[PDB]
Write a protein that binds this ligand. Structure first.
Ligand SMILES: Cc1nc(-c2[nH]c(Br)cc(=O)c2O)no1
Ligand SMILES: [Mn+2]
Ligand SMILES: [Mn+2]
Length: 179
């Protein structure tokens, strides 16, 4: 499958290795579930960019369940913020809130509604990015400055265009794996 080669060519080896772990540890083959592989890579990269564009952010995503829950519990004990039922992706120290990052191939409002209905906890802030350069955040609070969100949007659009240049974007968009 060309999707695997595209993933290995456009994503950092660290991100690819983390995605391979998240998949093979839980019984999934990145050679079979290629769309999910690409989606996990993209989501991890977006989370890491979000965090780097802050210090201000503590990355929960990219860790094993043990370490992620350890970090969440430590943040809850220090700041007193309520413990999320589902592992969020980041913690904002400035705004003092957990953040769930979503990357979708569908409309941002549909994915935002799905995410909100999933995590029935208003305190976890939701930020949805799309591959067409659109975003949607809880209360329209995008947390980051314009430049950081622009960089993330450019990266996402570039991933989509690279997929399209290899005739991979149609299969990826018509699939909902990873969201
Ligand atoms: C636990 C745990 N779940 C996730 C997760 N799963 C999917 Br599917 C889409 C996401 O955006 C996301 O953050 N990360 O940690
Ligand atoms: Mn997550
Ligand atoms: Mn997420």
């Amino acid at each position: 499958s060309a999707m695997e080669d595209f993933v290995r060519q456009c994503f950092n080896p660290m991100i690819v290795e983390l995605a391979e772990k998240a998949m093979k540890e839980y019984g999934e083959d990145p050679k079979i579930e290629t769309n999910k592989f690409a989606a996990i890579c993209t989501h991890l990269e977006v989370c890491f960019m979000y965090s780097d564009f802050g210090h201000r952010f503590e990355i929960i995503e990219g860790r094993d369940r043990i370490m992620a829950w350890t970090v969440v519990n430590s943040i809850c004990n220090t700041t007193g913020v309520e413990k999320p039922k589902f592992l969020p992706d980041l913690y904002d120290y400035k705004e003092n809130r957990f953040i769930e990052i979503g990357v979708t191939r569908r409309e941002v409002h549909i994915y935002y509604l799905e995410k909100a209905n999933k995590i029935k906890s208003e305190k976890t802030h939701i930020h949805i990015f799309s591959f067409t350069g659109e975003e949607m955040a809880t209360k329209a609070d995008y947390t980051l400055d314009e430049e950081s969100r622009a960089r993330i949007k450019t990266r996402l659009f570039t991933i989509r265009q690279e997929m399209a240049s290899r005739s991979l974007w149609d299969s990826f968009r018509q699939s909902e794996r990873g969201e």
